[PDB]
Amino acid sequence: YDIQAWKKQCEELLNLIFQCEDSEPFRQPVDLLEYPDYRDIIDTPMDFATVRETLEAGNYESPMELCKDVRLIFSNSKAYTPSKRSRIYSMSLRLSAFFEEHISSVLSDYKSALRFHKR
Numbered sequence: 723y724d725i726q727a728w729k730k731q732c733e734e735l736l737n738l739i740f741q742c743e744d745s746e747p748f749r750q751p752v753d754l755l756e757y758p759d760y761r762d763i764i765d766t767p768m769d770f771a772t773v774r775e776t777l778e779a780g781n782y783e784s785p786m787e788l789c790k791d792v793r794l795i796f797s798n799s800k801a802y803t804p805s806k807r808s809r810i811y812s813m814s815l816r817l818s819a820f821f822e823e824h825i826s827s828v829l830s831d832y833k834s835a836l837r838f839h840k841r
């Protein structure tokens with residue numbers, strides 16, 4: 723029933739993601755000095771520190787907006803990868819599976835709570 727519960731649930735999920743070794747390439751914005759053509763391919767960079775900061779600033783209205791930014795981290799990795807077998811991209815796939823498995827109940831509970839609120 724709790725319309726606000728998603729926020730702490732997302733904070734806890736981000737803490738687990740930061741402890742995951744697979745998140746290391748995605749914890750801070752992609753370094754343009756190491757990947758000089760990154761912005762020729764990626765229009766909207768995204769990373770987990772930006773997501774956490776957006777959440778902590780009170781700049782997400784719903785967990786769907788946070789989930790759109792997290793999915794952008796993974797689609798950027800897929801768009802930038804030179805190969806579907808590359809190390810960083812392979813780490814993004816595992817991390818994406820872990821994120822999707824945990825965010826599902828957050829989204830479901832929020833949407834159910836909001837439908838109850840508007841009943």
Ligand SMILES: CCn1cc(NC(=O)C2CCCC2)cn1
Binds near residue numbers: 802
């Ligand atoms: C292949 C594109 N790509 C780069 C990163 N990650 C990085 O640049 C981080 C910046 C700080 C330490 C390493 C993830 N994906």
